[PDB]
Amino acid sequence: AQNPNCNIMIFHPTKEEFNDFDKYIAYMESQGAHRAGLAKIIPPKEWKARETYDNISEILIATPLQQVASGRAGVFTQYHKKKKAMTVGEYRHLANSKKYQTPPHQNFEDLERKYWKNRIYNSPIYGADISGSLFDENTKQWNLGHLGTIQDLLEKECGVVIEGVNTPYLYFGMWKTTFAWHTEDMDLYSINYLHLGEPKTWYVVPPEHGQRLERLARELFPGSSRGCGAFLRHKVALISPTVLKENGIPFNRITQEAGEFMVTFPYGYHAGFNHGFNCAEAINFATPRWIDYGKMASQCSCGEARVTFSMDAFVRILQPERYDLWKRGQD
Ligand SMILES: O=C(O)CNC(=O)C(=O)O
Ligand SMILES: [Mg+2]
Ligand code: NI
Ligand SMILES: [Zn+2]
């Protein structure tokens, strides 16, 4: 078995190997990459996402989210308070202000220590989940707006044509902005490209051990667990690496820098934080190996998780027994 310790693997495809996205994902899996739940892909030196980032300041963040924490430093939830709209230029200036800017630090480890010590005492503003793309239309390799759609994959694997679309999303971050522990909708893959700015640190639990994280989360968030049998779908709970180590949960960590892709694999729980002002683009995707994960994915039916239009068909076709309850949650 390849990668039996479930380490995060880093890949350096050549420009030739960067042509066929599906083939390269299958290659990475042949080497055991999925066992970690997360992989890094460093593009060939010849590749670029677009020519410059000079003209992005007029993108609108219609609903910036202030991420307010409750709990203790290593075990907390966050809620998202909606803020007035602002442009990317306005948000960048805010991120760089004394109130929100990255503190002085020695290296990524020192910054990680400061994050876990102090996150809860601040409420950073995240421009998350903005439909759109920063890939130039002429970028033909690993252009996250030109991937094969998940509806087409389901159709190719299962023979059933379904409604829905699959488009990318932009994330504008600042110091301390946080993504809570989660797997993707329907335990899909994700791919994330850091277009510009400061790094993003990731934490990930191997898919084969995801249920250990869920059991700890039920213990640490006992009200939330009673509320919903899949409350990590709410994407609000944070657990630090120190707490994970104290409870014997297997995990790994890695820091993504500008110009790098990350891939999350089906049922790979992940969480993390931004180091400073940045912009990422991410999208879900599927492969043949996803199908069985999609069939077994948990679902939130309490009403909190509320998701996209396109999830309906995935539940309806892959999980018909759960469909009625799940849809009641959506309505
Ligand atoms: O970048 C973020 O805030 C969160 N991204 C992801 O969870 C992802 O790409 O799967
Ligand atoms: Mg602009
Ligand atoms: Ni994710
Ligand atoms: Zn729920």
Candidate of 130, 166, 270, 277 to mutate for ligand 1, largest count of ligand atoms within 8 Å of Cβ: 270
Q: What is the Cα–Cα distance from 159 to 182, expressed in whole angstroms?
A: 29
N-to-C CA span, the chain: 44
The correct CATH number of 1-331 out of 3.40.190.10, 3.30.9.30, 2.60.120.650, 3.30.390.10 is: 2.60.120.650
Q: Which amino acid is at 96?
A: N
CA of 127 to the centre of ligand 2 (A): 15
Specify which residues 255 forms β-bridges with.
201
Q: What is the Cα–Cα distance from 297 to 188, expressed in whole angstroms?
A: 9
Q: What is the Cα–Cα distance from 188 to 284, expressed in whole angstroms?
A: 6
Other CB atoms within a 10 A radius of the CB of residue 15 amount to 12
67 lines ligand 1 (CB under 6 A): no
Q: Which two tokens stand for residue 6?
A: 């479930």
| Nearest atom, ligand 1, residue 284 CA | 10
Phi, psi of 158 (to 5 degrees): -115, -15
Burial environment of residue 316 by CB neighbours within 10 A (0 to 12, 13 to 18, 19 or more): middle
Q: Which two tokens stand for residue 281?
A: 């683009």
Ligand nearest to the CA of 59: 2
CA of 279 to the centre of ligand 2 (A): 13
280 lines ligand 1 (CB under 6 A): yes
- Per-residue HEC secondary structure of 27-83 comes to HHHHCCHHHHCEEEECCCCCCCCCCCCCCCCCCEECCCEEEEEEEECCEEEEEEEEC
Phi, psi of 299 (to 5 degrees): -135, 145
193 lines ligand 1 (CB under 6 A): no
Q: Which two tokens stand for residue 236?
A: 């609000």
Q: CB–CB of 38/252 below 8 Å? A: yes
Resolution attained, angstroms: 1.2
CA of 156 to the centre of ligand 3 (A): 25
How far is C-alpha 160 from the geometric centre of its chain's CA atoms?
28
Domain limits of the chain? 1-331
278 lines ligand 1 (CB under 6 A): no
Q: CB–CB of 318/294 below 8 Å? A: yes
Which method, experimentally, gave rise to this model?
X-ray
